[PDB]
RNA sequence: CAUCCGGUCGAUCCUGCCGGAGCGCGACGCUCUCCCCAAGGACGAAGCCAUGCAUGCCCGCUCACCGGACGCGGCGGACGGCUCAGGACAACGGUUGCACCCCCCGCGGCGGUCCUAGCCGGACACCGCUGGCAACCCGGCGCCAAGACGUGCGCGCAAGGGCGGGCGCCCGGGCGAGCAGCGUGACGCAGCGACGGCCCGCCCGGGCUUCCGGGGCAUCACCCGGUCGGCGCGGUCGCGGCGCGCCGAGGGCCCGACGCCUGGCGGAGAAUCAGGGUUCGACUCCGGAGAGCGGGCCUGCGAGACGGCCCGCACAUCCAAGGACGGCAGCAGGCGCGGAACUUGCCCAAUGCGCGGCGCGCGAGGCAGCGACGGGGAGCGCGCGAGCGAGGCGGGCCCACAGCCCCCGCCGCGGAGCCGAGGGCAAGCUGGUGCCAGCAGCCGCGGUAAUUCCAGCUCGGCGAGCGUCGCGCGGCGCUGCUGCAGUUGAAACGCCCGUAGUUGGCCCCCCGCCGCCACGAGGAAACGGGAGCGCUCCAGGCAGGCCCGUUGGAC
RNA sequence: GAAGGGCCGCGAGCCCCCGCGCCUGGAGGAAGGAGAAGUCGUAACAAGGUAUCCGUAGGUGAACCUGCGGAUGGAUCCCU
């Protein structure tokens, strides 16, 4: 038993979809404690290297990093393992680019272009109403934020909109039947569809049944689905609308690139 | 029939086979221990001993010679055994109180050929092997 | 620990159960003289080779033919068999490969493919010029004689544009 | 040190477990408080440094605590005389040692000022009108460094009276 | 990727074993042209250790020398690296829970404090003067700083405690679940505040906990007595016989308890190969445990820590003999042991970690050296004359510096061994010796042709590799679930009753429950399988092309 | 608020006794195996010269002999 935490992380202990190279090393980055967890988040500098590619080295993301370059939700971040989530701001002004972090049908993190009408908020999941010091009611979210005197009307599990530079709530989704979702964890990351059921067993999970805009019908638990707007996205989505094709036509789509 | 086969009887296949399996003389020389604290070479490919006696023995009835072998003591164990030198001429090669390399034959620890009660052989003698001093690759000025 | 400690390696033949054989080392040096081969190692990967084949053949034959899994593999086997050029273009169907043999392999070898070209009066002679790198594939020059030729590049494989 | 881990003990067939590993500091106990009854000499309370920076503080000697008559809604602070009864020990009660359900007596005279003017339940006052009052420890001293309780009422006054009478 | 062969007889058929034939792991022995990848003191000594290195950085505090020193202070040193002694309802693997819990950095919030505030008080370190001692170590006096210590300006606020719901049950802050919060009567003034952080949530991590799995011996058959349960207190971050007092008597066992043994770390996995399986699992990833043996403790969010302190024991060192001092199962190196195992090399340039703004450090890690553990690719010729290798001398490319590969110029070292020739098992001619010397895994040869010994000729197998020794799988349907045998070859209890255990005829058209089949969710990779891609091929790797599914790394 | 002391708690080391496991000396006694071409007899294989064997009991230099009961793996598949 190690007296105290981890601070390390070896490359082949890293999370599958990080897609990180078996010979790169030894080592692999370790995020640092912030608004996402190890396993549900990516560190900067893979995305800031490996991926755009504006750097080739640790100490070029570094350089770039101190010199305030990236600003993650309107907040300028010099720590290259901070940890990038679902449904984050990446703007660069430096060239114009603005990505907005998604899930790709393949269950893997991407960015998505976005416009400057849509980049002054965010979406975020309520998970969690409690009651603070004074028995002031508070508000929690899947991006560690807390948010005090909610509106009665939200309850947990829905979808909320704020406003980047101010954390101030603007609307709210309700968690329904025929609302359009999109699942963050497990077999079908990255997937759209529409609630067609939801079953409770007490004392266990509930199960929550979606159907895809082609009539594929498909199976998750409400820890990860996450409405996305009503009936209709609220956020520009990837090019592909949430299919999964099957390793046939995978095949083919390869074969046609080739 | 003879042998149970019913749908709730694995525990006691399981036991008839555990028992039955030690009758067979091979499983039990290898998973019963005895034959490892009885082998001076404890579970080694070969091992080093000092000759203290160089001594011949007779074949058994049908034929007739007298083979060259020489008495060892194992550093390791400080039991004795007896090894037996095989290539012509070769006993001239080995002097009394010398450090040898002593390795088994074909058979694990049974007797070979009609040599009576020999298991071991000599194949290093002072560092050399004998199967390169009979070939005259090397020679044992040295000693 | 060191990274070199996670590079992968396999062997890539068998050797036969029972060494000596009449008819085997009859046909085994049959083959060696006619193909001029070096040693029985290269006959021995061909032989494991074909035991994938066979193998993979054998296992998608044993399904359904709408299984998904058997058309998947199956097409991708065949598409690689055609690319190489051991089996027949107009056979498109598993079966026809448990029938191929370790003769196809031999065939599509660079001292093969040059040798019925005219390009080289003999096996022995191709190997002899394969080593002094007189002869390229596709404008790049290969020195491996047992490097082998895809048909797309059937075509291509020539002289050496700075041999002499 | 002490220890409260449970691989020195024996299995539930009565047989020896065996020892894998040497002793860790999660595990580990305190000599006991033992808080004393003050019937150089006062109120001391000491520190401890607990596991997470925590504090705990742990009475050794006190003399005073806060007690409360539900049935009426009256509460103030009353001396405590002595403890005449504990249900784990007469040892304890012969050395006025403090601990969470002992039976003490307080003095009456925060209360008699304002009572005995007022309907109330009889037995209550005629206890008022003497010197002491019996009562319970609610708290735990040792662990938050104080010593508080309530009034007895009815049934459990009842078997506390009849207990003690005889001796 | 479903194979057999030789040996009991005067001959024959069987049972049955002995031996051969293959793969892998190591050691020994002979030999060795070129390139690529690559393991490396684990194997009843967790035995002993000279020598050098392995953890530092810096925002705050400069009347120091000419700001760099030094010191106070802060962060870190609890990660990483080594090994497998100990431990057999434990560790560990999968599956639950805390409505019995703690948590640094970081992210987001929140921020009201009972009764000199143009800025409070006193010290120590470095340093100066004077000194002790062999060394290690320190003493006394003296001016000075703080994001150091203490005190503390302020709208009431920490922990704990009493009271506050129903009338058979069910139909908001929140739950499956009366859980949270609040009010009110009394106690107590904890934390923050001389450049503003107490507190809350999330995150990583930890602690315990449900269910299932979790070595062998019956020449171990009965075992336990805080052992089993209940009440009460204490202690703990916290539940709990965790500890103490009292009460009762219980708990486990042929569905194998208890005891003993193990040359016992576990799993992901490895070897072998029709299918079913057998054996192993020191070592790359995860988890556990330890730092000579046995114990104890401070600091701190976090250690019962050992490149931290205290004691006993066993060892070891210096002494100007009064005293002082140590812990390589970290990297190199040495002794001992053994059948068995490498340089006392260079560097942070890459991957990461610590601190920190244009950087430092890191025996982690990388590069090189030895290296026939081992794996992959070429070659000692083709031809009647030309051509190309290795090798040397130079230039590039690469590299932290250098090699190496690769490319360009001038000269141009062409080298095969190890086993065998009666059968199994592919391959025969003279000369010696004479049951001697010797061969021979088994059958056997050798007492004058020795087809078997020792030599020459010739021939065969594999081939830069070949042979010998030990172990595991296969061979073996000779451990038999698939799938043996039991008249005579080895083997049916002398017979009956009988409990555990195993096995039990036929019948109901649909309901509930258990097994069963199929599908699905959820949960690490690496390995294995597998889609695509000409590292010149290959062992490999995840690349790569321009006019790329959003290029790809699907499953 | 130091040195120092008392009582309890964690708990090393040594002494005493008990038990368990693994090795090991020993006069003499007794078994087995191998080696050679030793001495005394012939028990078994043919009706092996008293048919052989099983169990039990006693006796004898040795193989073995005898008594009671049993089997044929016998030397008999066959007789009011
Ligand atoms: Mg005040
Ligand atoms: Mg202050
Ligand atoms: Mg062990
Ligand atoms: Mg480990
Ligand atoms: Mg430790
Ligand atoms: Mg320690
Ligand atoms: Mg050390
Ligand atoms: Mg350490
Ligand atoms: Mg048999
Ligand atoms: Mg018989
Ligand atoms: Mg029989
Ligand atoms: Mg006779
Ligand atoms: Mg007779
Ligand atoms: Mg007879």
Known sequence: ?258 | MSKTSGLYTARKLRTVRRVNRWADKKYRKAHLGTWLKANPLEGACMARGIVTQKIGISAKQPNSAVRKAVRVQLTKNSKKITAFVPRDGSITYIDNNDEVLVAGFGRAGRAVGDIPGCRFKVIKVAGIGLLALFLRKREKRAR | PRISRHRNSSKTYSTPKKPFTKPRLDAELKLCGEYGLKCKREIYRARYMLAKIRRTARNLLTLDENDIKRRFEGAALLRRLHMLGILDEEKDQLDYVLGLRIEDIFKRRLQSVIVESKLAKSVHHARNMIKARHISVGGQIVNIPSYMVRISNTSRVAIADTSS | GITHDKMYKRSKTGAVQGKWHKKRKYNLGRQPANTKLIVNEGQKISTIRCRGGNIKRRALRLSHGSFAWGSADISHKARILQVVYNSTSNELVRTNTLVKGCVVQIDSAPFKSALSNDTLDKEILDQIRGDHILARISSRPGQVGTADGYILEGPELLFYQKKLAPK
């Not at chain 1, 109403?129 to 009307?153: E, Q």
Request: hydrophobic share 35%; proline share 6%; with cysteine.
């Open chain 1, 1 to 258: 038993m190690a007296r105290g935490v981890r601070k390390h992380l070896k490359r082949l202990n890293a999370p599958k979809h990080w897609l990180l190279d078996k010979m790169g090393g030894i080592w692999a980055p370790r995020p640092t404690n912030g608004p996402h967890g190890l396993r549900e988040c990516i560190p900067l500098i893979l995305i800031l290297r490996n991926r755009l590619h504006y750097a080739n080295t640790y100490a070029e993301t570094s350089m770039i990093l101190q010199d305030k370059n990236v600003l993650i939700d309107g907040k300028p971040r010099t720590d290259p393992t901070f940890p990038v989530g679902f449904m984050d701001v990446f703007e660069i002004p430096k060239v114009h680019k603005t990505f907005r972090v998604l899930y790709d049908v393949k269950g893997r993190f991407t960015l998505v272009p976005i416009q400057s009408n849509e980049a002054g908020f965010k979406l975020c999941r309520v998970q969690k109403i409690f009651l603070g010091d004074k028995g002031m009611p508070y508000l929690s979210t899947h991006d560690a934020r807390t948010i005090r005197f909610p509106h009665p009307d939200i309850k947990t599990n829905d979808t909320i909109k704020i406003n980047l530079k101010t954390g101030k709530i603007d609307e709210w989704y309700k968690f329904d039947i025929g609302k359009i979702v999109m699942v963050t964890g497990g077999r079908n990351c990255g997937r759209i569809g529409t609630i067609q059921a939801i079953d409770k067993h007490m004392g266990s999970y509930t199960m929550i049944r979606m159907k895809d805009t082609e009539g594929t019908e498909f199976l998750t638990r409400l820890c990860n689905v996450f409405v996305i707007g009503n009936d209709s996205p609220a956020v520009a989505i990837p090019t592909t609308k949430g299919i999964r094709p099957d390793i046939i036509k995978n095949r083919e789509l390869r074969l046609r690139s080739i």
